[PDB]
Each structure stands twice: as C-alpha cells, then as structure tokens.
A paper describes a structure:
Members of the family of the Tri Longin domain (TLD) Rab-GEFs (guanine nucleotide exchange factors) act as activators of a subset of Rabs that play a critical role in late endosomal biogenesis. The best-studied TLD Rab-[name] is MC1, which activates [name] (Ypt7 in yeast) in endosomal maturation and autophagy. While GAPs promote the intrinsically low GTP hydrolysis rate of Rabs to switch them off, GEFs stimulate nucleotide release and the loading of Rab with GTP to convert the GTPase to its active conformation. To gain molecular insight into the targeting mechanism of MC1 and to understand how the complex is built in three dimensions, we determined the cryogenic electron microscopy (cryo-EM) structure of a stable MC1 complex from [name].
Residue numbers in the entry:
A (entry chain A): 195 to 323, 333 to 457, 485 to 663
B (entry chain C): 11 to 54, 94 to 155, 181 to 359, 460 to 476, 490 to 496, 530 to 583, 599 to 624, 646 to 667, ...
Write the structure that this text describes.
C-alpha cells in the first residue's frame, strides 16, 4: 500500500537479527516451502535461518490437524491472510497482506508447485522427500512478479502481440514447413507474448502446459539470464511420470528480444533442433517478419485513446474462457510526465490492486456474480473508481476516472467487448498447425 | 444419506486463567459436543478430555502467531475441509471457539458449504448470544468472574449456553442480512410519529407512552413490538402465538425504541431478549410462565433481573405488541404487585386497538431496501427472510449469501452486483447511512 516501493528489495543481511526479523515481519507478501517433516525448504523474502524459528508454529499447527485427519486449508487474521496448499510431501504456504482472496493464492502457489514438478518428475518428486539446486533463482524471481501484480498468472492465461491473421498464419506456415520428426510441440515468443504454436496430430498442447514454459523463461528467469543458446530438460503435467522432456531455447536476434522455443522427447535431438533454428533465421530475415516482430513488440500495449477515441477509461483488460488467452491496453498512460521508476511501479501495483478485489468478487463460492461495480474514492487525491463485468464465455475488466456511474461504463464496456471481438483474430490464437 | 451440517464442538476459554500446567486444564470454561447436544435436543472418557484441552492449545498459538504480522490480534476464521472453525474475542481476553462441521455429503464421500452459515454473521451471532447472555448475568463477563467466582460461572454459563446451542441452527435460516448487523428491528411503521401538533398515524400514542414512564412508579423505559398479528378469531381459540418458528422481516420490528436511561448499546440487548420470548415461547432463560390470573400478562414481580447497570423486568403480552416494562431495582414494592398489575392492564388497555392500526401504517419490478444507522443502531429493514422448507427456499440461499458476502469486502463507497437469474444489489454509504438498494428482475 504505502511501503511497497521499498518492499521489493531483499533483506540487507548486514544488521542484527532482531530488527532483521522485523523487516521480514511486516513485508507485504510471503511465499514459503516446507516439507512434510516441517523443515522449511525455500523462503523467498527470508533466509532459511529466519523462517525456521518462526515457521515451526505452522508445522506444529498442521501436525495436530494432520493427526486429526484434517489437512488444514487456510487462516485469516485482519488484513493478512494465510493460505496452505497440499501437494505431495511438500507443503505450500503463502502469507499475503494485500486484499487477495484464498483462490488467488491457490493459483499463485499452484504455479510455484508446477515449477518444482517441471524440473523433477513426479516419480522422483515424492521419493526425494538442496533438493532445488537450480530453481532457487527461478522461484525467487517468479515471486517478484506475483508481488508486482502478475496480470497473467492471476488471470491464468497468456498474452498476445498484435499481428494480423494473414501475417500470423504465414509465420505458422514457415514454422511448420521447417519441421523435423522430434517436435512434440514448439513455440515462438517475443517479449513474453506468444506468437505462434505448432502441434502434432495426436499429441495435444494442454493450456496448463504453456504456463510452465512462460513462467520459468519469460517472467521469472529472463531466459536464465540470457547466456545464448540453452538446452535444458523439462517435465510436463500432460506428459507426467516420464523422463525429462527436452526443450530448446535461444534468442532470435541478429522487450525487444525475441526467443524461440522448441521441444523434443529425445536427448540426441539438440543438433537437429540447433540446425532447425539456423534455417529458420535465414527464412525469417528473407521475408522480413523478424524485423516486423521487433517493431510490434517494442510498441506494445496500445494506447486506449487510440483504441477508442475520446474515452476516459484509464485501462483495459480482457479474457476469453474458450481458447484461453489474454489481452491488455496501455500501461504507461497513467502519467506521461512521470519517468522515475518509483511511480510507474506503484502505478502497476495499484492498478492490479484495483483488480485484485474484483477478481475475488467475481470468483466466489457458488455466488454467481456477473457484474461488479465499486468506487475507491480517495478522500483528497482523486475520484478513482473501478468497474467490472463478466460472462461464461469471456471476462472484461475496466477502470474509470472520477466521472463514474453505470452509464460511466456501460457506454463503453458494451463496445470494448466488440473491439476485442472485432480484433479477436489478431489478438487470440484459435489453434496451432 | 446426506448428513446435515451439525455443529461440532464449541469452547469458551480464557487464556489468562491458567499460567501453569496444573491450571492450564481449567482454561476451558464451557465445552460442547454433538453427544452433549443430544440430551438437550430432545428437550426442545479420559482420552476424550485430552483432545479437548489439546485443540485449544493451537488457538492460543494461532493468535500469538498472527498477532505479530499484521497487529490484527485475532485469527477470526480457521478454514479446514471438515469443520469450519471461527474465533471471536468477546471482551478483552475471553474467546469463543466454534467448529461448524461441514455438510457431509457421502460421489462416495464429498463435502460442501453451499448452505452452511457463513462465518461473517456467526461473529455477529455469537456476539448476539454473548450480549444476550450478559443481559441475564452481570454487567460485563469479566466483572462477572470477579463476583461469582470461577466455579459459579461454569454452572451459569453451562445453563445458558447449552440452551442456546441446543437449537442454534448453523444454516442460512431467518434473515441473515439483518443478522450480520446488530441493529434494532423496526416494523413497517417503524418508529412512531414524533412530536405533538400533528395527527398522522401513531403520533399522539407516544405521549401516553412517554407519559406512562412518569405516572407509574419506578418505570425507566418500555419497548413494544408487533411480532404477532391481530387477535385471530378463527376456529382455534389460542393459535399458540408463542411457540416454534422464526421472526418475520418487515413485520416483527420493534417499535417505540425507548425514551431514555438506556444506552443504545444495551438497548439492543433488551430488544434481542424481547425477540426470544416470541421466537421461543415459554422456553427462554428464566423460563417465563404466563400468569393464569391475568392472561394478558407474563413474568411479574413476586429473582429474574436485567443488567443494564439492574432493572427488574415484567412482561405485558397482547397478541401483538409485546411490552417490556423495565422497572427499577427498589422503587416498585413487590408487596403491592397485584394492584399495579390491574392498573397496568387498565392503563395499557386503550393502547391495543388504536395502536394496532397505527403500526399498520407504511411509508425496477421489485425493490427491497435496508437502512442501518451507526449512532442510533436502528435497522429499517425490508429484505424478506428465507421461508421454511416471497421467493422459493432454494433461491434465497444464494441471495442472502451474496448480500453479506460483499459487506465483508467493504468493511462514496458504492458497490454493485448481479446474478444470472437477475438481481441488482447496491451498497451505498453517505450521518453515515448504509442503504442497500437490493433489486430483482
């Protein structure tokens, strides 16, 4: 809320442990990993020395409940909320001080669990129970996004970049003619936004599988701190209880960066995949699509005023229940004069903190809300009031200025869906090839 | 084979009661179980003790754990899959712990909470019963311990709490929207016409009431309420007006909220206890038994008391308009009781027929509002209650679940909702007035 700008910074680890715990004590968000025996495995904002002393209570709490045949589900206390997730020997617990519902933390903790499973397959995941040798930085940076707001994981979808149907189709075709017999499925991404998908006839790309690839590469790891071509193993929930599936990641360069994802089920396919990229870059440069991709990726997040003329809506957000994807509008439109990183960070966090209550309101326990309206009118700052709307077929979010009312949103919400419906082919992928 | 969501165990403990292991066993003051409810339900082992004391041990651990994160002292709700556990601080160190066993639905073995009473109002319900309990024993529960001693509290606490939990249906029954707030129920007429100089309807009848507290000796305040209808002259003679059932919204609201000498905080209690005699006829704490000499009377000075800092109550009963005549501690002499009973039946005789039509006064397809005022605690209500097994039973489960779901979120400020079958719930705040412009179709 107020201390968020200094919240994202890590523990200094240069001051006595007394107030060190106090610094960890009041931070907004906390994600923890503790084993069934109660030993804490991973703590994001805290060192393992800090967590174990304080977190022994949770193990004590669950120990009684597991004995009473009651796997505990979650707490709540005033502003802060405690959520417990059970997945195998590992126990997932998250502490949230923001106005986040338990369902939001369940999704956020679920993504963290998927990362552990993606590196260690299910048969070895149970038997092995540090254990997370290379996923420490992967998990630490992933929790940074959740604190920053994560419009993707909170909504459980993927972004898209604005390319026309014909242009997108041409990329898919040139991504399919250059095919080898070891592409279980491959992806092309630019700046975190999916570009094209290639699929075989029988094997299916479960939308839950995509979130594994995007979260560990384009949101948390930054393609493992660049480094060039990387060949790393992978595990997918669809292809569970199998050996580590193999995925190829490399920058497609001669944000602005564009990366290429190819996946093979065999160890000795790296050279074929490496040769696959080499022939791909030549054809993309020959046609000029790669030069087009960087321009569109750089000028992403279209301005809402350009999308809709003379519209006071500060922001937009859209989703499609079938063919799970996700759209968005401009984000740097909060204040053009603002240039320092501190106001644009709070601009984002508050912006998703406007939607953090709305998503909880729509998704309740068999409450079946359809349209939700509110008003977070500041005492002196401004009359910033939120909006909201929904459908079993799609979801829409909105934010409006001090000029408010049902007509303050229905005058536009009924046509922002039409704009998304009009621009659905150039903003959402129905399927691969 | 659906198992209803019956109450599990409910405990009353003071963490500061025992600072040693030998004294830690006695932290529990009142304990309840499904087996314990069985003995009282029909009216309306060492290892077992180990589990009782052990489970509250986590609660003191839980409150201490979360107290240090957000400065928010209580872990109000503990969420599990079998038993929804709530925790409420009633008064400065006394805690009530309840465990609502979920709706067991053996899918060979499944759980649900589609109709389980949400924890947003049990805190209001438990505080209601606790405040209702404090209306019968002492001013404050903490001061009650210092007077009667630890041993005496358990007997009195068991006597009342075993009665309440014997029929505390943990389900969406009655009017949850009104139950979330404390509030004072106001009838269709609501508060009577104030002032002298206009006739209108139900205006000059306050002067006789406001004059009643003057002529009769030692009367501090009275309250009335149209729980029942006019005297039914149908086949059956009595209609058994006091008996099983539930209070009806927009009809049961108390009227003539008071005159003075009663704080608005403790004026809620007397109305709530006055609600009990109608809802639980002849079966309330104190066991009101109607007098055969004067049929239109109940209780009567002749032990029972009400603690508002100590008014001895008497109950004057017409078929509508339950009268709660609060008499002082000493000034009414119990020896001259029969003379006052005849005068009271005569003084309040001409306030039956004129008052009946007066309270019958009333002030986008269908609209139901609800006004709650913070400083005066009045609850002008219109939302209908769930009918027993204007809507159907199944619909109002969702409507009353969503109405109080958004109340917990908020606490301009305007909010709005909708549902597939068609509703429009609007919570608006402006004196702070909470208007609930709940619409439908």
């Amino acid at each position: 809320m107020e201390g968020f700008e200094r919240e994202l910074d890590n523990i200094p680890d240069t001051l006595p442990d007394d107030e060190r715990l106090a610094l960890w004590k009041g931070k907004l968000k906390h994600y923890l990993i503790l084993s069934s025996a109660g030993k804490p495995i991973w703590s994001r904002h805290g060192d393992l020395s800090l967590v174990n002393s304080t977190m022994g209570v949770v193990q004590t709490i669950i120990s009684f409940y597991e004995g009473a045949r009651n796997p505990l589900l979650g707490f709540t206390a005033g502003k802060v909320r405690f959520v417990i997730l059970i997945k195998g020997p590992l126990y997932f617990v998250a502490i949230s001080r923001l106005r986040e519902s338990d369902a939001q933390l369940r999704a956020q903790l679920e993504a963290l669990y998927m990362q552990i499973l993606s590196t260690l397959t299910l048969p070895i995941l149970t038997n092995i129970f540090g254990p997370l040798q290379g996923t420490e930085s992967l998990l630490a940076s992933l929790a940074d996004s959740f604190t920053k707001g994560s419009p993707s994981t909170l909504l459980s979808a993927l972004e898209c970049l604005r390319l026309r149907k014909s242009q997108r189709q041409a990329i898919t075709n040139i991504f399919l003619k250059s095919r080898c017999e070891e592409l279980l499925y491959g992806l092309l991404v630019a700046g975190g936004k999916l570009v094209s998908v290639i699929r075989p006839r029988k094997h299916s790309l479960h939308p839950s599988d995509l979130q594994l690839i995007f979260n560990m590469l384009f949101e948390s790891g930054g393609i493992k701190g660049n480094g060039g071509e990387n060949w790393i193993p992978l595990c997918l929930p669809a292809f569970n209880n199998t050996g580590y599936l193999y995925m190829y990641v490399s920058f497609l360069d001669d944000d602005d960066l564009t990366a290429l994802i190819l996946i093979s089920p065999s160890r000795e396919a790296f050279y074929a995949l490496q040769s696959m990229r080499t022939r791909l870059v030549s054809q993309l440069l020959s046609t000029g699509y790669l030069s087009l991709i960087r321009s569109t990726a750089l000028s992403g997040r279209p301005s809402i005023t350009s999308i809709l003329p003379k519209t006071p809506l500060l922001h937009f957000l859209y989703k499609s229940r079938p063919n799970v994807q996700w759209c968005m509008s401009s984000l740097s439109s909060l204040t053009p004069p603002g240039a320092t990183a501190t106001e644009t960070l709070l601009a984002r966090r508050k912006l998703m903190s406007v939607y953090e209550e709305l998503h909880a309101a729509l998704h309740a326990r068999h409450a079946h809300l359809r349209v939700v309206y509110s008003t977070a009118d500041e005492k002196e700052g401004e009359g910033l009031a939120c909006l909201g709307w929904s459908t079993p077929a799609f979801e829409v979010y909105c934010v409006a200025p001090g000029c408010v009312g049902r007509a303050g949103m229905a005058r536009e919400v009924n046509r922002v869906v039409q704009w998304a419906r009009r621009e659905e082919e150039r903003l959402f992928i129905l399927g691969g090839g | 084979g659906i198992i209803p969501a019956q109450l599990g165990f409910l405990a009353i403990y003071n963490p500061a009661l025992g600072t040693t292991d030998e004294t830690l066993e006695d932290q529990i003051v009142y304990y309840a179980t499904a087996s314990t409810l069985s003995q009282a339900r029909r009216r309306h082992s060492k290892e077992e003790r180990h589990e009782r004391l052990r489970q509250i041990g986590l609660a003191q651990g839980m409150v201490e754990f979360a107290k240090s994160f957000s400065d928010g002292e209580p872990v109000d709700t503990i969420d599990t899959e079998k038993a929804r556990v709530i925790l409420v601080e009633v008064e400065e160190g006394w805690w009530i712990l309840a465990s609502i066993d979920l709706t067991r639905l053996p899918p060979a073995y499944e759980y649900s909470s589609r109709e389980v009473k949400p924890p947003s109002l049990l805190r209001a319900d438990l505080l209601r019963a606790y405040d209702l309990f404090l209306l019968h024993h002492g001013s404050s529960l903490s001061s009650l311990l210092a007077s009667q001693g630890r041993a005496q509290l358990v007997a009195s606490l068991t006597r009342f709490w075993d009665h309440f939990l014997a029929t505390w249906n943990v389900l969406l029954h009655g009017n949850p929207a009104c139950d979330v707030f404390g509030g004072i129920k106001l009838a269709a007429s609501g508060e009577l016409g104030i002032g002298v100089g206009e006739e209108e309807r139900g205006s000059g009848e306050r002067e006789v009431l406001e004059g009643l507290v003057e002529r009769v000796e030692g009367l501090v305040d009275v309250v009335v309420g149209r729980y029942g209808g006019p005297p039914s002259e149908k086949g059956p003679e009595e209609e058994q007006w006091l008996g099983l059932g539930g209070e009806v919204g927009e009809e049961d609201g108390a009227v003539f909220l008071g005159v003075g000498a009663l704080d608005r905080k403790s004026l809620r209690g007397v109305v709530q206890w006055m609600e009990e005699v109608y809802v639980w006829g002849e079966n309330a704490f104190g066991k009101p038994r109607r007098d055969l000499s004067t049929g239109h009377f109940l209780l009567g000075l002749s032990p029972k008391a009400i603690f508002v800092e100590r008014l001895r109550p008497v109950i004057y009963v017409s078929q509508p308009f339950i009268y709660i005549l609060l008499f002082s501690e000493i000034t009414p002499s119990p020896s001259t009781w029969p003379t006052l009973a005849e005068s009271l039946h005569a003084q309040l005789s001409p306030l039956q027929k004129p008052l009946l039509h007066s309270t019958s006064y009333r002030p986008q397809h269908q609209i139901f509002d609800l006004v709650y005022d913070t400083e005066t605690l009045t609850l002008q209500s219109t939302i209908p209650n769930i009918p027993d097994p204007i809507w159907t039973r199944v619909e109002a489960l969702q409507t009353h679940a969503q109405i109080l779901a958004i109340l917990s979120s908020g606490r301009e400020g305007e909010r709005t909702c909708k549902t597939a079958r068609g509703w429009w719930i609007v919570w608006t705040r402006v004196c702070s007035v909470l208007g609930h412009l709940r619409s439908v179709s």
